[PDB]
Design a binder for this molecule. Structure first.
Ligand SMILES: [Zn+2]
Lengths: 62, 76, 33, 573, 234, 279, 336, 215
RNA sequence: CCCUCGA
């Protein structure tokens, strides 16, 4: 309902969403934009963003 | 077969992409390494693995380290 | 060649046609009202 | 990869970095003295600025942003003056007209933002159109002209090669392109004249390399004899070492073909530096191309008055048929519209017949640099029929060309369609943006979530069609339909052997194998049949048009699709 | 009037016969004032030695093929124009080349008269079978720049004498570029890059020094009009 | 001289369709088809034509020449849009010889509800009093306007009004002849109301001694700020002792030179690509 | 406290000094300690002085003052009202907008030293270089015609009447059969100089001081390259065109901001150059960031560069100390 | 044969200079190197700043003077002035109306010279008075008005754009023919400040020392 | 917001 409210017919979407006690899951990328969370796309995907970077032993030797 | 690369162009992007599965992973790769470097400089944890340029930015140091295969990364 | 204004610089015209009517005062739409 | 940044802009945007830097040096006692020192523009800051800006990318943006190339990353260069300097090749992506366009600059801060600018958004890492995959940062306008003039072969030019005769030796052959340049510095040789040169540093075309060279093929230093202009030799020096010599007059489409081939088979960095070289040569030679505009260069159709008089006779006949009662008003207007469309086409034909091909008005259009012959015809020949406020043709054409200048009535008549076209463009650019917003909102969450969903489903694409004769007709839709896909079923070709294996990119070589093998249909993977629950799998989507490789996991292809569909929307009438 | 920051000259040697030079920094606009004059001076102003005409025994009226030689006439001409030679004589000097039997004819087979030097003896000239022989005469002179063939046509020219294009210039190729260097607040200063490739007769260094010498004399013609005249000194 | 369609009693910008913004055949000689904004206000704002008047009832009139028995007279009549539809009006580019007779038997005219037709010269009621009659003041200042497409001609009319006054003005070598009468009527130039002799002149003021023995002094606007921040500066073009006449220009204004509108300079121009900087 | 007439003022200089009363709570603890131990009893104030905005310079040419001490009528609550007038001379510069009367416009992309401008045979450098590619497709050919007539007007002309009046000049007025140099002429709209008449005058163009004709009957001239000295290979169209300086000027345009004032309502930066605001990163700009799939840049733009109130300050704190950029917080606009 | 340079004078401020012979193709780039140095680097003298009594800034009028201060400064940009002092020197102008104030009315100190005495400066009536100080320095090229903050100057001083270059119009042509050679004809026109001969001489010194960088 | 204007 957060993604749809920011698109069109905001009044309608918000009344309908209130009557239905809808719970937005926040997984969308527009929702992530609104709440200030990294979008679930590109560099924001769990696969890339949680990368752990370590120097190899041979390089630490030198 | 390319001429001398300048600035951002160095190191070449084709070989950096040859080091990593996707460009996004190269971004987070080099970024987190650069943060490690800067933290090492300020904290007086592991320093640069190449010979740094004069004032050279930590992100450039990181990209050069990746180009030389000096570090490993887990995707998770 | 705009000869109806005294002291006007002489600007020679290529116009072939003769204009029988002078241009009215361009502010007449304001001042007249 | 660079952009001109005004000194004051860069000093403001980088203010804290400068402050810290000159605090570390003896220049400033504390950080507040650094602040006041930067606000006064003390002379010490400038050097420091040069140091803090190095390899720190910036984002440039021009509104409206129709697609993602409306924002690109550049390395900033301190430049004199108050204006932002834009690289000539990106003006296609930004649609920058340089008539007073302004752009915006944003400074990435965190390591991740800087990395994203260097890698994802760098100007020279997106050369290709993400929509059609075609090259985007490409010579156009002056550059094209400069290359076109450079590579044109002029029969009978100065220094042209001549065959030996009795008592007359063979002239116009050179031991090296250096010697041909020395001859060109004198008035002896024309850059556009056909000659024979001995090239050791360029690869010959495929036929010549096969027939004239052994197992090794061509190698640097191996001498071969070429019949070509010095201009085409210089042009091929811009291309990468080892690229086969192209002996051709360079039309925009030939340049596009070469650059696309380069992007496919060569590293993207080589593409960047190459198109830089093409830019420099194109500008230098456009200056010396001799294209200019004069009232003398605008030529008029010789028979025009006789033509328009003939079609005037026809019009008079139609009018007499109307007052006779033999025609409607709508039928009369329809007849007159046909008459003056025909007369306009004939005046355009005679006009085109009268023009030489080296005329500036002609060469500027025919090279692909700018414009079209309808504009040429409106200028030189006639304007023709003009449209009402309602959009209907006025039965009375404008016979005057803009070179002749229009009568007052013709000018008034033309204003209808001119202005209505202006407002029409105003609305078109709005509705296009609305449709773009709806497409973005419906496709926004479509993302590549996985490598392969391994679905066997697919779509049948028509690769070609067989004529009554044995020749097969190339399908006009191959570029946007069959290309860039990924194969869902191996191609059997009505024979035992399989031409291409499932999962291949179906690029130009694979398409050629499929066509030569005589296969008229293919089953490809599509996002329509993709079985991935959330979003799509990379394999079903196939190639990324921008990178030319398989789409990365995480690329948002719904937004890319919506931008690709919406950006051209302003051009649809 | 004033005194600018003293520009420096630097050399990066690319190969033995090729080098780049940079002059920098230059007051804005001076890069183009030095650039084309330095390029055209390097090309046209340095004296060298070159082949002017050739005599080939066995070819007289039609110049097409030489019996017993694989290369045709004009290819022999191409191979000869690429011959690198120095001469002290200041007057035209004829050298002779003769070889018989099967084998390869190279510039090393030339017998130089006293005062000339062939610097590329290993250069392939022709190739001969057993039945053919190559007897060819060469007239070498000194000059400047590149003179076309028709200017080498003698009014009393001998039968069978073939005039050739002459490359006197010891420098083969020169290009120049003007970039911007930063001096304090000014980012528009001029930097001059010269990419110069010569033969093995001269190095790029000595070619640049020679062009500079003859230029200093040339504009010295103007300086000498008044020696009291004041100008930029740096 | 603007004619605005927006306001109280007018139409809302929201409710203005594309049919209101179109050039209309009744505009001829009344509202300039060229000059109008190219932004969202296109077609909602227009300029009064050079010869147009506003009649006592609010309707715009334009003068025409009586055509009697195929001869073109010098009698002038101001017609409204309604009166113009009952008659047949020949364009000014229609050729006439020394006599009032038309050169051609067929002439392109506007007759009924704005249709353009080859028509018999035998029946012609009125004729335009001049070219530029359909055009505004700013549009009448475009030389070779007839050789320019209506869109660029629109851009030209709007761009002249964006020109900044220069420290020194210079009249154009190539005018349309409208520049003088535009500068005087605009009123940023100083004009002598009565003929006389210049008694005293300085940068501050000009005094003219009339033959009456009465004198009149004109104070100069000196480095005055206009609403948009340009510089309104008047300078006297007359000298002490000069004899001037009623209507003569005493002093130049910001964009005037010798009484003609000077909006720019005459520059030596070369048409050619140059090393990509004019790209 | 008011700047003196005739002073040269650069951005940041004080035009009018002004102080505003400041409360006790608004002092820093350090500022409070010094005022106490030093026995400063003076009113606590903030410096509200009127300063020159960024990117502005000039001379003070005027001052007006209105005081409530006098009878000057002022709005309610206003004691004193001061106006300061600054005048600047603006030289033409890169980024200014020029235009002709035919709709032909452009920014100045480069101003060149007069020496490397292309020049005519007598040494005259050209003033302006317009690109060929932009003329024809715009269908304004008057700019060319004007340029032809501008040259004839500049150099003057005398048509050859010896054998008689040529056919191409037969309809010209007798006063146009010759013209002195720098003659001013008028070509009215829809009754102009005809194509053939303009073409004939191009033949009778008067010479220069040396008797040399610089422009041929086609309206073209041979030009020299100012940089290399080599002549350009083909005759270029040259003439005199009337060019205007349009009121879009770089000085009023160039703007940049590191940090600055924020809206009290939405806690986003202000906007406009006058308010020292930031650039709007809009919906379509965010689509581009998502299309690139750059998450950290888009999050950074919408949190610590705009909304996030603790982050924007912690970020500046980290740059000055040369540390890593902190992780973004919650944008204020969401709480709103 | 070595090339030679001969001068043929046309007017007192205009001369032609022939350089022959030269290797073919060499004339254009030489004459243009000289032209580039002439239009830019030739030393000269110009007014740096002025001070008018009663005016503290340039946008204003002087009582009884017909041209305002901005127009007066425009007229003073046409001054041609030659100074031997090689340091700032001051010239004075004091005139009471009525009449015409011309550059002849300037009183230069010893060592500096006004070369166009008839140049119009201002027009004065019975109430007009003009008292002006004009600072003169030596330089090259064009330096825009030096801001007072860059100086220690006070408010009454009005800096001016300084056009130093004494040369006026420069061109060349070549006659292309010994065996093959190029003849250079260089056309130099200066102001009355200095002679074409001397301008070409200083150009020669500048280029001689500059090309000395290539040994 | 509105007026007016730039791409
Ligand atoms: Zn799938």
């Amino acid at each position: 309902w957060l993604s749809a409210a920011s698109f069109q017919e905001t009044t309608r979407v918000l009344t309908d969403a209130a009557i239905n006690c809808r719970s937005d899951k926040l997984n969308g990328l527009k929702e992530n934009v609104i709440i200030g969370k990294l979008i679930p796309a590109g560099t924001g995907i769990n696969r890339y963003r949680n990368i752990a970077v370590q120097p190899t032993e041979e390089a630490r030797a030198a | 077969g390319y001429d001398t690369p300048l600035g951002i162009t160095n190191p070449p992007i084709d070989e950096l992409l040859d080091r990593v599965s996707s460009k996004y992973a190269l971004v987070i790769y080099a970024a987190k390494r650069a943060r490690q470097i800067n933290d090492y400089y300020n904290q007086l944890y592991v320093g640069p693995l190449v010979e740094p340029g004069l004032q050279e930015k930590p992100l450039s140091i990181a990209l050069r380290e990746i180009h030389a295969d000096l570090l490993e990364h887990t995707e998770g | 060649s705009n000869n109806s204004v005294p002291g006007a610089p002489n600007r020679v015209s290529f116009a072939k046609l003769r204009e029988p009517l002078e241009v009215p005062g361009l502010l007449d739409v304001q001042t007249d009202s | 990869h660079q952009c001109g940044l005004p000194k004051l802009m860069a000093l403001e945007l980088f203010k804290p970095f400068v402050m810290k830097r000159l605090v570390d040096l003896n220049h400033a006692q504390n950080i507040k003295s650094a602040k006041r020192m930067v606000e006064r523009q003390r002379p010490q800051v400038w050097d420091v600025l040069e140091e803090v800006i190095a390899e720190h990318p910036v984002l440039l943006n021009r509104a409206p942003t129709l697609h993602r190339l409306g924002i690109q990353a550049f390395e900033p260069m301190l430049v004199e003056g108050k204006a932002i300097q834009l690289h000539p090749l990106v003006c296609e992506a930004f649609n920058a007209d340089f008539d007073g366009d302004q752009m915006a600059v944003h400074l990435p801060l965190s390591a991740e933002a800087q990395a994203e600018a260097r890698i994802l958004m760098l100007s020279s890492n997106n050369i290709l159109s993400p929509a059609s995959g075609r090259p985007l940062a490409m010579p156009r306008l002056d550059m094209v002209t400069g290359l076109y003039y450079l590579t044109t072969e002029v029969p009978g030019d100065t220094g042209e090669y001549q065959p030996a005769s009795g008592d007359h030796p063979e002239t116009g052959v050179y031991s090296s392109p250096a010697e041909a340049i020395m001859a060109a510095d004198r008035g002896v040789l024309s850059v556009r004249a056909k000659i024979k040169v001995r090239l050791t540093q360029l690869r010959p075309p495929v036929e010549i390399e096969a027939e004239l060279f052994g197992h090794s093929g061509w190698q640097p230093g191996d001498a071969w004899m070429a019949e070509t202009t010095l201009g085409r030799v210089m042009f091929n020096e811009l291309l990468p070492l080892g690229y086969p010599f192209v002996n051709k007059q360079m039309h925009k489409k030939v340049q596009a073909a070469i650059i696309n081939d380069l992007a496919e088979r060569y590293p993207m960095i080589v593409v960047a530096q190459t198109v830089d070289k093409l830019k420099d040569a194109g500008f230098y030679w456009a200056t010396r191309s001799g294209v200019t505009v004069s009232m003398a260069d605008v030529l008029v159709p010789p028979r025009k008055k006789e033509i328009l008089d003939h079609y005037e006779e026809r019009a008079d006949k139609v009018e007499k048929q109307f007052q006779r009662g033999a025609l409607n008003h709508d039928e009369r207007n329809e007849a007159l519209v046909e008459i003056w469309k025909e007369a306009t086409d004939e005046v355009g034909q005679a006009l085109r017949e009268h023009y030489p091909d080296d005329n500036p008005i002609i060469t500027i259009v025919d090279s692909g640099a700018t414009g079209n012959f309808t504009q040429t015809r409106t200028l030189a020949g006639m304007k023709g029929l003009v449209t009402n406020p309602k959009g209907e043709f006025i039965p009375r054409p404008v016979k005057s060309s803009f070179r002749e200048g229009l009568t007052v009535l013709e000018y008034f008549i033309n204003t209808h369609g001119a202005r209505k076209g202006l407002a029409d463009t105003a609305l078109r650019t709005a509705d296009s943006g609305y449709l773009t917003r709806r497409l973005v909102d419906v496709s926004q969450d479509v993302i590549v979530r996985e490598h392969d969903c391994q679905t066997e489903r697919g779509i049948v694409v028509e690769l070609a069609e067989r004529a009554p004769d044995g020749t097969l007709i190339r399908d006009p839709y191959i570029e946007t339909s069959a290309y860039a896909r990924t194969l869902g079923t191996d191609a059997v070709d009505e024979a035992g052997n399989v031409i291409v294996e499932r999962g291949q990119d179906l690029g130009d070589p694979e398409i050629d194998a499929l066509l030569a093998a005589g296969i008229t249909q293919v089953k490809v993977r599509s996002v329509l049949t993709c079985a991935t629950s959330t979003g799509v799998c990379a394999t079903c989507y196939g190639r990324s048009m921008a990178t030319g490789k398989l789409v990365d996991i995480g690329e948002a292809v719904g937004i890319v699709a919506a931008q690709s569909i919406g950006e051209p929307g302003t051009q649809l009438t | 009037m004033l005194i600018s920051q003293r520009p420096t000259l630097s050399e990066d040697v690319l190969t033995d016969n090729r080098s780049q030079f940079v002059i920098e920094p230059l007051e804005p606009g001076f890069g183009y004032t030095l650039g084309n004059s330095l390029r055209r001076t390097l090309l046209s102003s340095i004296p060298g030695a070159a082949v002017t005409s050739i005599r080939i025994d066995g070819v007289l009226h039609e110049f097409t093929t030489v019996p017993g030689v694989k290369e045709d006439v004009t290819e022999i001409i191409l191979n000869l124009k690429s011959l690198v030679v120095s001469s002290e004589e200041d007057e035209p000097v004829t050298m002779y080349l003769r070889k018989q039997g099967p084998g390869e004819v190279t510039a090393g087979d030339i017998v130089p008269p006293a005062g000339v030097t062939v610097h590329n003896p290993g250069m392939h000239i022709a190739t001969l079978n057993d039945k053919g022989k190559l007897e060819v005469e060469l007239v070498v002179e000194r000059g400047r720049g590149y003179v076309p063939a028709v200017q080498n046509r003698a009014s009393g020219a001998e039968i069978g004498r073939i005039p050739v294009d002459s490359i006197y210039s010891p420098v083969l190729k020169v290009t120049y570029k003007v970039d911007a260097t930063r001096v304090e607040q000014r980012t528009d200063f001029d930097k001059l890059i010269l990419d110069v490739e010569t033969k093995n007769s001269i190095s790029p260094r000595d070619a640049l020094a020679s062009a500079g010498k003859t230029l200093v004399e040339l504009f010295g013609l103007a300086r000498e009009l008044n020696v009291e005249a004041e100008g930029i000194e740096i | 001289r603007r004619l605005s369609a927006l306001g109280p009693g007018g139409l809302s910008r929201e409710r203005a369709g594309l049919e209101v913004r179109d050039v209309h055949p009744s505009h001829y000689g009344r509202m300039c088809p060229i000059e109008t904004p190219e932004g969202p206000n296109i077609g909602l704002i227009g300029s009064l034509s050079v010869y147009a008047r506003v009649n006592p009832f609010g309707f715009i009139e334009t003068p025409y020449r009586k055509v009697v028995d195929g001869v073109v007279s010098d009698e002038i009549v101001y017609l409204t849009a309604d009166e113009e539809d009952r008659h047949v009006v020949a364009q000014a580019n229609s050729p006439i010889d020394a006599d009032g007779r038309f050169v051609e038997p067929r002439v392109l005219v506007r007759r009924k509800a704005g249709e353009v037709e080859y028509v018999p010269s035998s029946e012609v009621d009125y004729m335009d009093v001049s070219p530029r009659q359909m055009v505004s003041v700013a549009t009448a200042m475009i030389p070779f306007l007839e050789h320019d497409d209506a869109n660029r001609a629109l851009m030209g009319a709007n761009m002249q009004r964006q020109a900044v006054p220069l420290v020194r003005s210079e009249a154009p070598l190539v005018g349309t002849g409208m520049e003088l009468r535009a500068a005087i009527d605009a009123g940023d130039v100083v004009v002598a109301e009565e003929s006389g002799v210049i008694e005293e002149v300085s940068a501050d003021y000009i005094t003219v001694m009339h033959d009456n023995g009465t004198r009149r002094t004109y104070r100069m606007r000196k480095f005055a700020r206009s609403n948009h921040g340009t510089c309104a500066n008047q300078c006297p073009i007359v000298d002490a002792g000069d004899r001037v006449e009623a209507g003569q220009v005493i002093a130049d204004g910001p964009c005037t030179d010798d009484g003609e509108m000077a909006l720019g300079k005459n520059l030596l121009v070369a048409i050619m690509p140059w090393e990509g900087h004019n790209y | 406290g008011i700047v003196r007439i005739g002073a040269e003022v650069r951005d940041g200089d004080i035009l009018v000094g002004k102080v505003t009363p400041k409360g006790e709570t608004e002092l820093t603890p350090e500022e409070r300690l010094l005022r106490a131990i030093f026995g400063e009893k003076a009113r606590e104030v903030r410096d509200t002085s009127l300063k020159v905005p960024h990117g502005e310079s000039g001379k003070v040419i005027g001052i007006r003052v209105f005081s409530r001490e006098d009878e000057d009528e002022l709005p309610a609550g206003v004691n004193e009202l001061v106006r300061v007038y600054v005048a600047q001379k603006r030289k033409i510069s890169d980024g200014d907008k020029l235009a002709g009367r035919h709709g032909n416009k452009g920014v100045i992309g480069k101003i060149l030293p007069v020496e490397d401008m292309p020049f005519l045979a007598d040494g005259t450098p050209v003033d302006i270089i317009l690109n060929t590619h932009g003329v024809p497709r715009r269908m304004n050919i008057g700019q060319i015609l004007e340029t032809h007539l501008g040259w004839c007007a500049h150099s003057g002309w005398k048509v050859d009447a010896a054998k008689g009046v040529p056919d191409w000049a037969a309809r010209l007025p007798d006063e146009l059969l010759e013209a002195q140099p720098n003659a001013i002429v008028s070509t009215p709209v829809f009754d102009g100089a005809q194509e053939a008449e303009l073409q004939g005058l191009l033949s009778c163009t008067l010479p220069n001081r040396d008797g040399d004709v610089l422009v041929d009957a086609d309206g073209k001239a041979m030009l020299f390259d100012g940089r290399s000295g080599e002549p350009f290979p083909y005759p270029v169209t040259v003439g005199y065109m009337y060019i205007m300086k349009l009121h879009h000027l770089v000085d009023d345009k160039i703007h940049a901001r590191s940090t600055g004032p924020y809206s009290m309502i939405t806690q986003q930066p202000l906007g406009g150059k006058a308010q020292f605001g930031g650039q709007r990163f809009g919906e379509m700009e965010c689509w581009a960031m998502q299309a690139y799939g750059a998450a950290y840049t888009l999050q950074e733009l919408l949190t610590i560069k705009s909304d996030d109130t603790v982050g924007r300050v912690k970020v500046y704190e980290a740059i000055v100390k040369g540390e890593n950029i902190p992780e973004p917080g919650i944008p204020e606009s969401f709480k709103v």
